[PDB]
Amino acid sequence: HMNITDIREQFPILHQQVNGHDLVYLDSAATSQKPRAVIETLDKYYNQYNSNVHRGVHTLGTRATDGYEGAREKVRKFINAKSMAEIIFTKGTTTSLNMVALSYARANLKPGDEVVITYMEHHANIIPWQQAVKATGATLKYIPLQEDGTISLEDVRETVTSNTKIVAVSHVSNVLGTVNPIKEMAKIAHDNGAVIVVDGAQSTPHMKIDVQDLDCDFFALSSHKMCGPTGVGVLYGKKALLENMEPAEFGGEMIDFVGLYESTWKELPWKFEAGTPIIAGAIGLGAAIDFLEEIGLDEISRHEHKLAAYALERFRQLDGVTVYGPEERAGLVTFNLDDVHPHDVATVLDAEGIAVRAGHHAAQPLMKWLDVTATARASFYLYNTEEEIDKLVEALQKTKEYFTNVFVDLEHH
């Protein structure tokens, strides 16, 4: 099994105090921390072999090109795509989903067509579709949720019709922890003549992804949530769909011939990568994938199952706390204390060294569905332990007691 002491030794940032208390970082659904292997990969790139790529002209240029395209093959293997032509490097999940909405949706929707999403989506997998349907005169529809914040395949079958052209859905929700039944939803979409676009930002860092098992048409993910550098992501798309989509950005590197008025494009995947690419960040994401693969995604998923079952049990020990979403879940808990605003919960916890996030988590329609204005969220990854969950629940108990005390004191004035 994975040894959590040995894993934590690899993350320099965990070893410090905040406000006089050891840091307890429980905000990896907002962004993850990085191991030495990734930070030293960036250092070795800038100290030894930085150059621009795809010249084949000089020695450092060749080294940088081999590093960048090597990282593309690491991503391909990591999500079990069939080809490097299906792996496009982007700035992040949000840009990957925008590319699909601009190049696929805006080119393939007409009045009467539908895009189907769900109430639990993150804004990155809502607003691009709102705009693409507005641009095309198509219709946006929402799959409803069950009362525990899961999706039933009967509701999917009801909402998706033979006029649906695109179903877009998260693999795992960054608020509910729900793992959605994507392989079954891809069957339903395809049976109705639609493609499925999967927002993989919260699944890819935490569980194995196999796009040939899922059969998703597009899948998007972000490096900064999976121990890799900021500023980089991937869009996977089945090669036959990418071949027919036009580029979302235009420039150098993605062309073959440029005349005064007309140009032709390079083959995939470079068609979709305009400009000097994100060279160091993509090589660092390759290092993150080597790091996670050496531990094992199934080992990390098993650890997070342990931490989430422990947290849900310990949260049920607290009076006056509501947890949103299903019992079977990814490694996060979003909650509120009955009489304390979640921002004040996050502030008090940060004074005890503990980092969580409060707000809408970029899911305003979901907060409205939950009937709340904001929530607090503790989210876990491979470097967190049950002792840190103990600290969190002990701090929530003291938070409850503190706010009730100030209430009672103020009661006289």
Ligand X SMILES: Cc1ncc(COP(=O)(O)O)c(CNc2co[nH]c2=O)c1O
Q: Which of residues 348-387 bind a second copy (CB under 8 A)?
A: 349-350, 354-359, 362, 364-365
> What's the token pair of residue 65?
């090109």
Is the CB of 105 or the CB of 124 nearer to ligand X?
124
Give the binding-site size for ligand X (rule: CB under 6 A): 21
Q: How far is the CB of 52 from ligand X (least distance, A)?
A: 5
Angle between helices 386-412 and 297-316 (to 10 degrees): 30
Give the binding-site size for a second copy (rule: CB under 8 A): 88
> What's the token pair of residue 158?
């009801």
Whose structure tokens read 């011939």? 257
Beta-strand relationship, 21-22 and 17-18: antiparallel
The option from ligand X, a second copy, none interacting with 199 (CB < 5 to 8 A, set by class) reads ligand X
Q: In the chain, how long is the greatest CA-to-CA distance?
A: 81
Q: How far is the CB of 251 from a second copy (least distance, A)?
A: 4
Angle between helices 36-44 and 279-295 (to 10 degrees): 150
30 makes contact with ligand X (CB under 6 A): yes
The option from a second copy, ligand X, none interacting with 111 (CB < 5 to 8 A, set by class) reads none
Is the CB of 30 or the CB of 328 nearer to a second copy?
30
The beta-carbon contacts of 143-146 under 8 Å, at least 24 apart in sequence, are 143/116, 143/117, 143/118, 143/119, 143/169, 144/119, 145/118, 145/119, 145/120, 145/369
352 makes contact with ligand X (CB under 6 A): no
Applying the rule CB under 8 A, the residues between 244 and 263 that interact with a second copy are 249-253, 255, 257-263
Closest C-alpha among 61, 81, 41 to residue 232: 41
The option from a second copy, ligand X, none interacting with 358 (CB < 5 to 8 A, set by class) reads a second copy
> Applying CB under 6 A, which part among 7-15, 196-204, 316-324, 337-345 lies near ligand X?
196-204
| 318-to-330, 390, 394 alpha-carbon distances in Å | 21, 12, 9
231 makes contact with a second copy (CB under 8 A): yes
Q: How far is the CB of 214 from ligand X (least distance, A)?
A: 15
Q: What is the CA radius of gyration of the chain?
A: 23
For residue 172, what are the β-bridge partners? 179
Out of 24, 88, 124, 209, which residue is the one contacting ligand X (CB under 6 A)?
124
238 makes contact with ligand X (CB under 6 A): no
Q: Which burial class, exposed, middle or buried, applies to 54 when counting CB atoms under 10 A from its CB (0-12, 13-18, 19+)?
A: middle
> Applying CB under 6 A, which part among 57-65, 119-127, 182-190, 279-287 lies near ligand X?
119-127
Applying the rule CB under 8 A, the residues between 40 and 99 that interact with a second copy are 42-43, 46-52, 55, 57-61, 91-95, 97-98
Q: How far is the CB of 3 from a second copy (least distance, A)?
A: 22
The option from ligand X, a second copy, none interacting with 365 (CB < 5 to 8 A, set by class) reads a second copy
The option from ligand X, a second copy, none interacting with 205 (CB < 5 to 8 A, set by class) reads none
Distance CA 394, CA 392 (A): 5
Residues 83, 117, 161, 115: what is their CA dihedral angle, to the nearest 10 degrees? Answer: -80
Is the CB of 94 or the CB of 385 nearer to a second copy?
94
Instruction: Give just the sign of the alpha carbon dihedral 387, 12, 28, 26.
Output: positive
201 makes contact with ligand X (CB under 6 A): yes
Q: Count H helices, E strands: the chain?
A: 15, 17
E runs forming strands in 300-349: 321-324, 332-337
Applying the rule CB under 8 A, the residues between 262 and 321 that interact with a second copy are 262-263, 274-281
Question: Which residues here bind ligand X, judged by CB under 6 A?
Answer: 29-30, 52, 92-94, 122, 124-125, 170, 174, 199, 201-202, 222, 224, 252, 275-276, 361-362
